Design an enzyme around this catalytic site. Structure first.
Site, PDB file in Angstrom:
ATOM      1  N   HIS A   7       0.802  -1.234   0.000  1.00  0.00           N
ATOM      2  CA  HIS A   7       0.000   0.000   0.000  1.00  0.00           C
ATOM      3  C   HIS A   7       0.837   1.287   0.000  1.00  0.00           C
ATOM      4  O   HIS A   7       0.352   2.353  -0.396  1.00  0.00           O
ATOM      5  CB  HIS A   7      -1.055   0.002   1.117  1.00  0.00           C
ATOM      6  CG  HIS A   7      -0.547   0.473   2.451  1.00  0.00           C
ATOM      7  ND1 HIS A   7      -0.134  -0.393   3.439  1.00  0.00           N
ATOM      8  CD2 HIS A   7      -0.403   1.720   2.962  1.00  0.00           C
ATOM      9  CE1 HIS A   7       0.258   0.299   4.494  1.00  0.00           C
ATOM     10  NE2 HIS A   7       0.105   1.583   4.231  1.00  0.00           N
ATOM     11  N   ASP A  37      -0.588  -7.489   1.761  1.00  0.00           N
ATOM     12  CA  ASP A  37       0.031  -6.160   1.819  1.00  0.00           C
ATOM     13  C   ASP A  37       1.548  -6.272   2.045  1.00  0.00           C
ATOM     14  O   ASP A  37       2.057  -5.992   3.146  1.00  0.00           O
ATOM     15  CB  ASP A  37      -0.645  -5.299   2.906  1.00  0.00           C
ATOM     16  CG  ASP A  37      -0.267  -3.811   2.826  1.00  0.00           C
ATOM     17  OD1 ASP A  37       0.339  -3.368   1.834  1.00  0.00           O
ATOM     18  OD2 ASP A  37      -0.573  -3.063   3.772  1.00  0.00           O
ATOM     19  N   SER A  48       3.509   3.178   8.521  1.00  0.00           N
ATOM     20  CA  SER A  48       3.085   2.008   7.752  1.00  0.00           C
ATOM     21  C   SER A  48       4.172   1.554   6.762  1.00  0.00           C
ATOM     22  O   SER A  48       4.942   2.376   6.249  1.00  0.00           O
ATOM     23  CB  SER A  48       1.705   2.212   7.105  1.00  0.00           C
ATOM     24  OG  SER A  48       1.737   3.160   6.053  1.00  0.00           O
ATOM     25  N   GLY A  49       4.246   0.244   6.530  1.00  0.00           N
ATOM     26  CA  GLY A  49       5.356  -0.344   5.771  1.00  0.00           C
ATOM     27  C   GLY A  49       6.547  -0.701   6.641  1.00  0.00           C
ATOM     28  O   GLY A  49       7.390  -1.525   6.257  1.00  0.00           O
TER      29      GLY A  49
HETATM   30  C1  LIG Z   1      -7.900  -1.817   5.150  1.00  0.00           C
HETATM   31  N1  LIG Z   1      -8.742  -0.652   4.844  1.00  0.00           N
HETATM   32  C2  LIG Z   1      -8.784  -0.477   3.384  1.00  0.00           C
HETATM   33  C3  LIG Z   1     -10.111  -0.917   5.305  1.00  0.00           C
HETATM   34  C4  LIG Z   1      -8.273   0.560   5.551  1.00  0.00           C
HETATM   35  C5  LIG Z   1      -7.012   1.228   5.007  1.00  0.00           C
HETATM   36  C6  LIG Z   1      -6.900   2.651   5.570  1.00  0.00           C
HETATM   37  N2  LIG Z   1      -5.523   3.193   5.756  1.00  0.00           N
HETATM   38  C7  LIG Z   1      -4.737   3.383   4.590  1.00  0.00           C
HETATM   39  O1  LIG Z   1      -5.202   3.618   3.489  1.00  0.00           O
HETATM   40  C8  LIG Z   1      -3.267   3.284   4.844  1.00  0.00           C
HETATM   41  C9  LIG Z   1      -3.189   2.454   6.115  1.00  0.00           C
HETATM   42  C10 LIG Z   1      -4.631   2.433   6.564  1.00  0.00           C
HETATM   43  O2  LIG Z   1      -5.029   1.835   7.539  1.00  0.00           O
HETATM   44  C11 LIG Z   1      -2.214   3.241   7.008  1.00  0.00           C
HETATM   45  C12 LIG Z   1      -2.273   2.939   8.471  1.00  0.00           C
HETATM   46  C13 LIG Z   1      -1.474   1.901   8.964  1.00  0.00           C
HETATM   47  C14 LIG Z   1      -1.503   1.577  10.322  1.00  0.00           C
HETATM   48  C15 LIG Z   1      -2.311   2.296  11.209  1.00  0.00           C
HETATM   49  C16 LIG Z   1      -2.356   1.951  12.670  1.00  0.00           C
HETATM   50  N3  LIG Z   1      -1.766   0.930  13.160  1.00  0.00           N
HETATM   51  N4  LIG Z   1      -3.075   2.732  13.459  1.00  0.00           N
HETATM   52  C17 LIG Z   1      -3.107   3.341  10.720  1.00  0.00           C
HETATM   53  C18 LIG Z   1      -3.084   3.658   9.359  1.00  0.00           C
HETATM   54  N5  LIG Z   1      -2.418   4.663   6.643  1.00  0.00           N
HETATM   55  C19 LIG Z   1      -1.177   5.448   6.816  1.00  0.00           C
HETATM   56  C20 LIG Z   1      -0.561   5.710   5.441  1.00  0.00           C
HETATM   57  C21 LIG Z   1      -1.512   5.105   4.416  1.00  0.00           C
HETATM   58  C22 LIG Z   1      -2.754   4.673   5.200  1.00  0.00           C
END
Ligand SMILES: C[N+](C)(C)CCCN1C(=O)[C@@H]2[C@H](C1=O)[C@H](c1ccc(C(=N)N)cc1)N1CCC[C@@H]21
Ligand code: NA
Lengths: 49, 222
Positions: B42, B77, B174-175
């Site tokens: 992602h 992912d 993330s990543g």
């Molecule tokens: C799985 N679905 C499609 C239902 C939700 C994805 C929503 N969002 C992103 O798009 C990514 C990812 C995320 O959850 C990610 C993310 C990763 C981890 C967390 C957490 N552990 N709280 C939160 C957001 N966001 C940060 C940068 C891109 C977005």
């Protein structure tokens, strides 16, 4: 059975009878067949100290 | 990272940062070798162009993203980046270990906790961190997680973190790495994948389950 008790005393990977220990890349199994010894200054998975 | 603590110097050396054309971080990664970085598929949709920073900046040669990645669920992912020029290991720059699959399932995934790290937001509605942070996150029962989640949790995901305590990974992490310590050696167990907000009550962090992809990773690194 044996790997489920303190990891068969292996430092890293444990497999089973008898116990057989092994190590990740960049490590050598010690003479005792349990410990994992680095081969260089930056082995994987070690903090840099 | 919301909560947790700043890494001491040398404490989180496997951390990579994906940076845009203006040297701004938007995602993390994990150093696997001199040429390879593990990250989330992602993260490949977050910028038009990007490079990798460790600790030195490295350009990407090949992006090997999982063929089954789905933007809708975030299933599969996972991506591997092959770098154009090799990383020089040094203070603060060293790879995390890839475990054997069977052992990782029986032994690492069954530890009480792992460690997530990153330069991302320090609050859901806050700013990114200048300093690298880390956070110990309890592994969470699969049934507990499915009960908490508004979205599908697949066999390629696991959950970690806290029900009510306000600590979690966040946007910009993330990543990045989720590693599990076993007798002072740190093994790759997860990739920061998704969450419903950050550190929300009744919600956990969701992670790509690396054990499901150890063969795929080996194939991709040849
Ligand atoms: C799985 N679905 C499609 C239902 C939700 C994805 C929503 N969002 C992103 O798009 C990514 C990812 C995320 O959850 C990610 C993310 C990763 C981890 C967390 C957490 N552990 N709280 C939160 C957001 N966001 C940060 C940068 C891109 C977005
Ligand atoms: Na929570």
């Amino acid at each position: 059975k044996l790997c489920s008790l303190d990891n068969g005393d292996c430092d890293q990977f444990c497999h089973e009878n008898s116990v057989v220990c092994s190590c990740a890349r960049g490590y050598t199994l010690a003479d005792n067949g349990k410990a994992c010894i680095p081969t260089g200054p930056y082995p994987c998975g070690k903090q840099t100290l | 990272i919301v909560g947790g603590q700043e890494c001491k110097d040398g404490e989180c050396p496997w951390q990579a940062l994906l940076i845009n054309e203006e040297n701004e971080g938007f995602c993390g990664g994990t150093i696997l070798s001199e040429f390879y970085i593990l990250t989330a598929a992602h993260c490949l949709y977050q910028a038009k162009r990007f490079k990798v920073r460790v600790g030195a900046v490295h350009e990407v040669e090949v992006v090997i993203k999982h063929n089954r990645f789905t933007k809708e669920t975030y299933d599969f992912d996972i991506a591997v980046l092959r770098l154009k020029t090799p990383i020089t290991f040094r203070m603060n720059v060293a790879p995390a270990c890839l475990p054997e699959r069977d052992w990782a399932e029986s032994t690492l995934m069954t530890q009480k906790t792992g460690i997530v790290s990153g330069f991302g937001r320090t609050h859901e509605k806050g700013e990114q961190s200048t300093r690298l942070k880390m956070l110990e996150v309890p592994y969470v029962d699969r049934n507990s997680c499915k009960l908490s989640s508004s979205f599908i949790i697949t066999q390629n995901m696991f959950c970690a973190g806290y029900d009510t305590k306000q600590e979690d990974a966040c946007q910009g992490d993330s990543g990045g790495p989720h590693v599990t310590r076993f007798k002072d050696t740190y093994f790759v167990t997860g990739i920061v994948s998704w969450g419903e907000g950050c550190a929300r009550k009744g919600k956990y962090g969701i992670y790509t389950k690396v054990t499901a992809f150890l063969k795929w990773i080996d194939r991709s690194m040849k």
